[model samples]
Every structure is written in C-alpha cells, then in structure tokens.
Target: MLQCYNCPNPTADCKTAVNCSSDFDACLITKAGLQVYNKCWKFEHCNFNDVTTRLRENELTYYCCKKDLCNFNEQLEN
Candidate 1:
C-alpha cells in the first residue's frame, strides 16, 4: 500500500490521487524517513516532527496533524 508523507490524515482516496500524469509518485519511503512529495510540482512536507526518533525499523505508525499541537506520545515497536 502507498502512504502519504505530507498529508497528516491521508485517506484512501488521497493516497491514490494522481499528483502527476507522467510519474507514479503517490508515496515514498526512505531509510531516514517517509515522506510524500508532489510529483507535478516538487513540493515536500513532513506529517510529523521527530519521526526518526518516533519510528523504528520495519514499524508503522499513524499521524493526524500537521501542526505541533497534537500529542506525540505514541511509539512503534521495533
């Protein structure tokens, strides 16, 4: 499944949205972290801050806000 990095609350529809016609750039993951970039324009945004510390190897977590007002107490198991 594809995941969005910019969208804090990415829905099923948003993940499948066509951001670009020539490229299939819906979601991207890296060793450093995961993020969603706009293929048509070239924009990048992070869903949450301190994702490196919050995430572990081969683990998944959900975020719900772009702002820093939400609580980030959740931790993923390694």
Candidate 2:
C-alpha cells in the first residue's frame, strides 16, 4: 500500500497525507505556476503526456512517483 500527500484543492503547499487505495499505484504532483496539487493516481495513467492531455492545461507541469509519501514536495521540477 502506498501513502501519498493528498490535496485535491489548489494549494500553495499541502501537508495532509493519505493511504492510497489498492487500485492507486502512484503518487502524482501537479504544479501550475504557484499552485500545486498532490494525489493518488493509477500507474498506467501516470505518464506526463497522458495526464497533461486529460488535464487540458498547457501550463501545468506534473510528475509521478511510486512510493509512500512521494507527492509531499510542492516544488516543481522547473
């Protein structure tokens, strides 16, 4: 079971953590300028291109990690 930072809302930084469901195998962190979102995601749908396309946000930059508490960081790679 993977645990990850969970913040569905737009936030500057989120500290809450959640144990992901069995179906969720990845931790996703999405960044759009100053706001960031952290949540559980499916491994198959964790690709940058796929996630970006579904989000439909050109400015969003996000990444995925497969580990407990992996989405805790709010800093974007850029």
Candidate 3:
C-alpha cells in the first residue's frame, strides 16, 4: 500500500502514515522553519513548486516528487 508521512501536529514525533488519492500524485514537503510552520502535502502535480513558493513569498521551499509513498521520507530528526 502507498503511504505518505502525515504531520498535522507541531511535534515531529506525531508523524504517521497517511493515504492520499491517486490524483495526489506529487509530494510536496514545505516549511517556513524560521518563520514557523512546517508540513508535507500531497499535491496534484509536481509543478506546484513555483506556485507554492510565491504563495509564501519565498519563505517556503517545496521538495516535489512523484511516486507511491514518496512523501513518507519527510521527517525532522533534529
């Protein structure tokens, strides 16, 4: 089964596996660390990088990828 890392809570340890729709073919890991807030989103397209960047005024950087369970690697060890 395909899965992605889910992080709705501020604490990184709260991460769990989550299932997304087939349309959610892209994985976007974004974070405005210094400004606060970090998240992993299953986007519909891999090209959403620029749009999300602009939405955050360059504060957020997105790591986009395509594949099943691709976003599962999103984790903050520190």
Candidate 4:
C-alpha cells in the first residue's frame, strides 16, 4: 500500500491516507513543473530515514508520500 503523488501528478486529490504501517514501504512526492501542489499520504509515521525540505512564499512547491491506495511506493524503514 504505497501512495504519494503530486506535481503534474493528478488523479483524485490530495491529503488523504490512513491504514498503513510496519516500518512503511510506500510513499513519495514530486514537484518540478507547474502542477501547483500534490497529495497522497497516510504517513502512518516515521521513525527515521525520512527526507525533508519545505520553503513557502509565492512559488508553490510541496511533496508527500503515504501508501494507502497506490503509486510513489515506499522503500525505506530502517
């Protein structure tokens, strides 16, 4: 169960995901075009091995990952 898509990434919506855990194994986010924002994350929670970089002002840019549907599958739990 991996979800986390954004950027030109369009499908259903964003900000909605729950029912996943066990070190996690799916979650992702992307933004390099002009898709505004992105969504898809259950983010059961993170213990470590997580990347972070957020800066807001005018030029929008966001990213998230939390498999509960499908896509940006996870690959880190250690």
Candidate 5:
C-alpha cells in the first residue's frame, strides 16, 4: 500500500511514480554516472554492500527506503 517513484531510466524531473504491491515493502534507487533507475523492491533485497562487493569495478550506488515515495530523492543525505 506504499507509493514510490518509478523510473527505469530517468535523468531530471523524475516525477513518475507507482503504488507498490503488498509484497514490495521498499523502494530502491540505483545510480551510475548519468544513468539512474528507481523501482519498488522487497525489503530484504536492499543489500547495497553485497551487490557492490560482487561488482568491484562497477561504480553503481544504491539507495533503499521504506517510506512512501522514498525514492523521489536522487541525492543522499550529508
């Protein structure tokens, strides 16, 4: 019953969004240079460390949150 920003590939003004199903308890955002992706996800799958560890050479960053429309922000808190 949560809403989250949903953009497979967005640059700027990423306002598109969707309602998350019961199974998808979280929102995830991934960024690599100018490419970015946002989508609904399962809470248990928010493993940035495990993912990045496997792709050591890749420069992808991930963010996950449980709040509604959490993936709306593209920048992390300082």
Candidate 6:
C-alpha cells in the first residue's frame, strides 16, 4: 500500500486535510515546495516529483496528498 511520508497522521489527519471544508485544502508536495490551494482543497509539495506518466499518458497531477504529504498552512497531517 502507498504511504504518506510527510503526513504526521496519514489516517485521520490526512483525511481531514483532504476534506474541502478542512483548513488544509490543496496539500501537495513537489520539488519546489508545499502548495495549498484553499479554493480547491488541493495541497502540493515541491520537494518531490509532482507528475508522472502512466498507461493513460502524462498524468500531470499533484499526488502530494497521497505520499509526500507536505504540511500545508503549518498544519500537520498524518
């Protein structure tokens, strides 16, 4: 199973972090830094690769919330 390496509480905290109503909206990790899109509940990290290619082609979607859960708004997410 995939695990979030940056989230403090990958189960509960991560859940709240992903919720649109939660403080943490767009929490994603990339090679640049952590990004939080408050308008879409999307988090991003710049410390790692944010995009990847698959059978469907270039899946240029930030997957920080899945693995590298960079803290958004200084909030910890498991």
Number of the predicted model whose TM-score against the real structure is largest: 2
Query: Which residue pairs of candidate 1 clash?
Result: none
Q: 42, model 4: CA deviation in Å?
A: 14
Candidate lDDT values, in order = 0.28, 0.78, 0.46, 0.37, 0.69, 0.31
> Quick one: RMSD of model 2?
1.9
Candidate 1, residues 1-78, lDDT tens digits: the string is: 222233333222223332233332233222322422211211132233333333433433433332222212221121
lDDT of 5 by residue, 1-78 (tens): 889887665545467779988888988776655666677886686677644553342667778898877875545431
Candidate numbers, best TM-score first, in rank order: 2, 5, 3, 4, 1, 6
Candidates in order, TM-scores: namely: 0.19, 0.81, 0.48, 0.25, 0.72, 0.19
Worst 10 residues of 1 by lDDT: 69-78
What's model 5's lDDT at 78?
15
> What lDDT score is found at residue 9 in candidate 4?
35
lDDT of 3 by residue, 1-78 (tens): 345555664343335556655545555455545432223444443344553554444544456555544543253221
Worst 10 residues of 6 by lDDT: 52-61
Report the poorest 10 consecutive residues by lDDT, candidate 5. 50-59
Candidate 3, residue 45: Cα displacement in angstroms equals 5.3
Better of 3 and 5 by lDDT: 5
- Each candidate's number of clashing pairs is 0, 0, 0, 7, 0, 25
Q: Give lDDT for model 3.
A: 0.46
lDDT of 6 at 60: 26
Better of 3 and 6 by lDDT: 3
**How many Å off is the CA of 5 in candidate 1?**
16
lDDT by residue (tens digit), candidate 4, 1-78: 443443333433445454444445544443333333344333542212332233232332333444344433222121
